[PDB]
Amino acid sequence: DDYIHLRKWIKRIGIILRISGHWPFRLPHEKRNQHKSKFRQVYSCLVITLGFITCSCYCIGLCLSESIAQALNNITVTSYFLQSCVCYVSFIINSRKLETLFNYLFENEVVGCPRGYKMSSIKTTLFRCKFVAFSLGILSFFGWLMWTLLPLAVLVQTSLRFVEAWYPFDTTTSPMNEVIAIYEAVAMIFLITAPMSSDIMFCVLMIFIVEHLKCLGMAIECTLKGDATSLCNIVDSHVKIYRTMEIVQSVYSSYFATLFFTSCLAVCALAYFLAATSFTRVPGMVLYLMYIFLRIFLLCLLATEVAEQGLNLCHAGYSSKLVLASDHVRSTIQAIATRAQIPLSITGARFFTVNLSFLASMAGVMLTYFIVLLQVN
Amino acid sequence: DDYIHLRKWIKRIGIILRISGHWPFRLPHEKRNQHKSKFRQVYSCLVITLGFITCSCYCIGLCLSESIAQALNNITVTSYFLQSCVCYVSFIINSRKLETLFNYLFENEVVGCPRGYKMSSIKTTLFRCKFVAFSLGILSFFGWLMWTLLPLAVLVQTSLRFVEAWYPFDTTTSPMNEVIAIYEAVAMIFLITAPMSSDIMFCVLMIFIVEHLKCLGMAIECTLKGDATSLCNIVDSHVKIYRTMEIVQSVYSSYFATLFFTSCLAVCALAYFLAATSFTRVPGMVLYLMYIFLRIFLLCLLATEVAEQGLNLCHAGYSSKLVLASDHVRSTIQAIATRAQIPLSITGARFFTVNLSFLASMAGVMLTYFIVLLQVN
Amino acid sequence: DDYIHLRKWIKRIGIILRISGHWPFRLPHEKRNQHKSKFRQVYSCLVITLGFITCSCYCIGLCLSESIAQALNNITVTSYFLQSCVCYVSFIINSRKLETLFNYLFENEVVGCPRGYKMSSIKTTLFRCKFVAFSLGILSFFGWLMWTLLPLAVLVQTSLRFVEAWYPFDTTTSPMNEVIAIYEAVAMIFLITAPMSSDIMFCVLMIFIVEHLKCLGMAIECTLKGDATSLCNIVDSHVKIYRTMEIVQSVYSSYFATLFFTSCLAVCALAYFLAATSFTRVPGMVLYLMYIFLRIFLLCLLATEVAEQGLNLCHAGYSSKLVLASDHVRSTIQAIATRAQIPLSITGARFFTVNLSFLASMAGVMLTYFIVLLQVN
Amino acid sequence: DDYIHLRKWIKRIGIILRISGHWPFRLPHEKRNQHKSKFRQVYSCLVITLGFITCSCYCIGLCLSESIAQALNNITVTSYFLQSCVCYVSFIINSRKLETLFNYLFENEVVGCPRGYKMSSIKTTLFRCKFVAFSLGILSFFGWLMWTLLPLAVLVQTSLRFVEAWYPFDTTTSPMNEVIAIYEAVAMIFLITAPMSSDIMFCVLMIFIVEHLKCLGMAIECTLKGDATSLCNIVDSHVKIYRTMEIVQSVYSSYFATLFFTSCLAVCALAYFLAATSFTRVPGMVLYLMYIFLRIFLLCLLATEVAEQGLNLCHAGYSSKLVLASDHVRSTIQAIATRAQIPLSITGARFFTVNLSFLASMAGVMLTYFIVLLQVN
């Protein structure tokens, strides 16, 4: 039933990842080696070299510092573009571990859990992944729309760029402004759709791992309430969880680091420009602020959820029946517990572990720095 | 003897919770389904919709920002009202887990502990719960009295509101001021009595859980000094402790988060208004400052006490007799210890774990922020 | 041999504690109930009521705030006096646990350790305790000397008080200044000798506990290299270590809290007065700064040493022979390790755990606060 | 094959350490007691007394504070020289533990690991140690070259000192400036080559320990997939790892502490001089900034790598076969895991544990302090 619909959803996950111009890899429903086709490779290289030249144009526009007052006005845009750049190279560096992750995410049936839990698990996973995917997609589309379309609509020269960008031609005359306008429009579309897609895939992985942990705990209490075989299957599922989390930690680290850094810098610049300096500008800046904050909050929440479920897995099979089991179960449960005491955490290039606590600390120091450097100055 | 008096006290706990206008649930001494009576439901809905309209009136008075200098003068009052709002919805969202918690708190006799410890336990619990309940009740009553009655007594128009609030009528003329005065008086009474009641119930739960932990440790050393049955009873009591703490964590998280946030913001505003700006105002503001600080300190203390008693439970039954026991006791004690190494902590919406250490850190950053932003500016 | 000299040293420890006016308790070499003698009790009550009236005089001199600029000039002196006050009441509240601690510290021979380690242990303990005791005593004597004697010597009225203090008589005329000078001199002598004595006793306890831990580790490796009896003796010694550390945590908490707080406040005031405001004053203030810093550093070092030795005790008996021992040793060593994973830490009223890391954090925030509030202002 | 080349490399490590003027100790390829030769001892004493007199000259030049504005201009140079001083005495205090460390680092073959892993291990270790050694050597040589040669080349008096230094002769006249120029040139050469050499040896030790940990994990999974003997060899190798890490912690602590402290102070001074105050100066200061940052980053990275590999060693041999092994393996693996839960961390004089997280925190507070104290002031 809905198990087929979930597989259609994770097929859509691969499809939207191929649309955004990442390097294509083998999907689970791919048995003809179509992931090395000419069309997809040409599309990928075209979109990534367009993103690379646009980001370099904005960076050299930054290095051609017009003044300090507009410099922060540049930062944020280049900030977001920088993220896209990093994300691209990451998906080309580790394009086999992604195949491994999708192969895990296609079939993850832990054996022994009761069915009444399994169907509710499928329902809850479908609901939450639909919610997060639709939310981030709508927010990204509205972000592009507000950041690109509106100043064109003020005119109908186009003079729509929220900050000016370096170009070979001067972009001053009436034909050139229009050409650079349409070029920047399609460019920023294909740039904004990349980190949204990577974020959506990370959130899907986190949701699936959380539900697999809860089903593993249910299987543990089920085999305790009931000799060797169930424990072997449970231990295999747990070590598979750990290896999958290790792979996810291996791929996402640099992207998380650059995301956190350039995001807090862009929010500081955005507050500096919105606070004391002078009607059309405020919708775009408030929408970009919400686009940063909601994304960071979703990442921190779905990163803390898996660690909480691991420490919940620590308290599994801990009842009176444990005092009446054999020595074999009494030792294997001990082994599972002392392995579960290690926290399954994701860190950004080993600089910081992404939790809700790190979000609170970063928000505290960012609020502090912004409010002092704008108020006493 | 006093075991009956303690049950009368926890009946009073339910009674004062019903008085403050929360949604009524089944008490342990309720065998006629009176918790769904018409009178109690009508009273609950009336008080909560009055609180909801008053909080919205103060919030729209805030959004109608008269000036910045009076804006902080608004914040604190709306701050406290905000807490009440959140608390209301929480007790209606989880109105069955509260029944479960009261059913646990009515009978919690751990089997095997010596009687000489049990009677002293009853005595100490009665003393401490009486102390905390009377202290918070007297402080809340004096807080309302000072914040409402005195500026009326300066007159006998009433012109008593410590900050003006938005209303449909202008409240300027002499009849209207009096009507809004009595309305705000009864409103703030029924608003102040809610978080005090929730705090008192949380403190009662924490005290009972702490004493149950100490009795569990006494039972562990008793059954070690003395085969299977006592260990099963001890493990069952421990896992019951853990499930109860999980339920308490599940209900109180949003309230703790909003409490900490809007409380530190209100204290910052209160210091800004008391420090450098201009005899009647100072008693009310110092009493509100004490009302914030003592409440936060009581919460942090009774939250750290249970974690300390858990880590104390880690060092249970650890003597020479452990080296002479069977393998069975030697494995079950190991299991109890490695489960007890997990800290039983309460966190506010998983943002921060409420300890004395978090109170010290928050007080440090609050003192820092206030003293810099008032002194160098 | 030197074992007798060490007992003479810990007798001197009790003697200097009786000299400073604490409430007398039973020493180990006291078999005639002389700790309840009339002379010692009269001396104790006289010195503590003199300290209590002098501290209250300085506190009411503070509350009679002459100006803000001299107010910080008051703080530090009252700061130190405050510590003395707290220390007094603590030693009268728990005057039996101190007897228990001294009874432990008199005989602590762990059985089974090799003799070549035991004699070197006695030597190292004697050396380090002599060092710390002589250092703190000389520093305290020079602190009193510089803070009291020198401005009298500038004259030979006395006009020597580094900050003026409230008194019933005006202290302005020539007879009164001299009388208050000699009164404050003997008062500050008997006040300064109290926290130095408590600190010296704490340092002696920490040194003895550290050396006992190292000898316990040596005994563990000795009985592993060599069946039941040695393990029972080792476990008994370890749990005795834990109970002693619990008692030390129970007594010293309030004193550590007030010490850290009023010490960092006094150092901030001292820096404010020394930095930008105007030859005789600078020796006293630099000596008081060193007296604060060296004391705090000694406390943090000898507090971190015991935790490091506990985590060193975690890695005990971990060799190839563990793989060839019986199941009995293999389980008891596991129990010792999983108990040793709990850190033996001292905390100040459960607000913060005194480590070198807390000293680094406090020094960082203190340096920050001082340098900003003096420079940008 | 390359095993001989690696031994030639670690011979070069000893050779470059002898060149920089440290006190010579016995190398593994030294069977004639040549480490106590007259030539090497004379060279060592000459270079260290030259470093000692130059550092004291710069320190007394600092204490002869010309003005505040040039004072920070002094700090950095004295800062670096201070490190050299400390490093010298450390290598003379513990000149036997270094022999022990080199004797470990010469032969570290863990028995039982598969050969296909061992050859790749040798290859990866050779690559990474070559990389780090060549990088730090080239950076140090260019640092000396820019900091000494260029202002001489501006002339061809010499007037090349980036900050003036105290000397017995006035250094003002034309002969004296040249003599002090050549003296300071050879001095700063022999001073800069010391902490680079100590850093290179620390990095080699960290790389070898990391690879030994990975090979130990491979040996664990190999002996689990395959009775007593392999486990004894594995446990012996693990405890040898722990003792080696303890020795490295014992020697490097004071050097790490002084490095972190005087390095962040020098970077703050360097930013203060580069930011707002006035073409030749900027290459030297940017090269010194890179020389500080890259060194600190390399140290933090190779310090965090070993802790990550230890927590990776925690998850060793955790498969289904563990559920089918004997009780003996099931207990020894448990012992290995609960010992591996202790983090193998290096700390700087027990003030702070050097991780990437401490680098992030220090960079945050340094950025904060610099930007506030330069901007609002």
Author numbering:
A (entry chain A), B (entry chain B), C (entry chain C), D (entry chain D): 12 to 167, 178 to 247, 317 to 368, 371 to 469
Question: Anything the authors wrote about it?
Answer:
Using cryo-electron microscopy, we elucidated the structure of MhOR5 in multiple gating states, alone and in complex with two of its agonists—the odorant eugenol and the insect repellent DEET. As in Orco, each MhOR5 subunit contributes a single helix (S7b) to the central ion conduction pathway, and their S0–S6 helices form a loosely packed domain that projects radially away from the pore axis.
We used single-particle cryo-electron microscopy (cryo-EM) to elucidate the structure of the MhOR5 tetramer. We obtained a density map at 3.3 Å resolution, which allowed us to unambiguously build a model for the majority of the protein, with the exception of several extra-membranous loops and the short intracellular N terminus and extracellular C terminus. Within the membrane, the contacts between MhOR5 subunits are minimal and confined to the pore, whereas about 75% of the residues that form inter-subunit interactions reside within the intracellular ‘anchor’ domain, formed from the intertwined S4–S7 helices of all four subunits. In particular, Val468 protrudes into the channel lumen, generating a hydrophobic constriction measuring about 5.3 Å in diameter, and thus serves as a gate to impede the flow of hydrated ions through the quadrivial pore.
